[PDB]
Amino acid sequence: GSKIISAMQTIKCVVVGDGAVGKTCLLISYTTNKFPSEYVPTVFDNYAVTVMIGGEPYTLGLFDTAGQEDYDRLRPLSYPQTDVFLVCFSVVSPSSFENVKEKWVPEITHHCPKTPFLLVGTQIDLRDDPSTIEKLAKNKQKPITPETAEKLARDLKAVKYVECSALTQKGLKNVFDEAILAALEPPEPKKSRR
């Protein structure tokens, strides 16, 4: 019975995998909607901002691999929290979204198979640019197909599968509505009688 609508349930997202090695831009836009086109690691990072689905605020605390001199304990005390799982999907690489299955599912659902599973297409701003080509250029270009992505999201049945470059926003408000809907899970006392 969550309190009335709204309220920053706080959504700590655990991004797993790299996907076209371009997940940075996502976190950037996840907070500044301005990926590396005009963003770079020149200041302290790691934080949660508050977004808005339809007028409700939901913080998103992004958490990637380790990388802290402080050396946190093997078991963080964030157990009692959200901790969603943003499986970075790769539509700008050759079936890169599939290595995701190989180690990302064993890192998110085999690890925390609670519900928050969001398959998000990454670096989609280069899916149409040669930018993501050097990333692989094995195929001199190769974006995920409609039989590729659904192919593995069908294998994990995440919370939801989409595509949206960090800065593009063709579905970030959706992955963000999901990432939050995956870490804020609203009550289900809906009213029937259509």
Annotated binding site for GTP: 17-24, 64-68, 122-125
What is the three-class DSSP state of 71?
coil
Q: At 64, phi and psi to the nearest 5?
A: -105, -155
Query: What end-to-end distance do the CA atoms of the chain give, in Å?
Result: 23
Point out which residues pair with 49 in neighbouring strands.
60
DSSP state of 101: I
Report residue 76 CA to chain centroid gap: 21
Binding-site residue ranges: 17-24, 64-68, 122-125
Is residue 27 within 8 A of residue 13, CB to CB? The reply is: no
Structure tokens at 155: 């294998």
Q: Determine phi and psi for 24, rounding to 5 degrees.
A: -55, -60
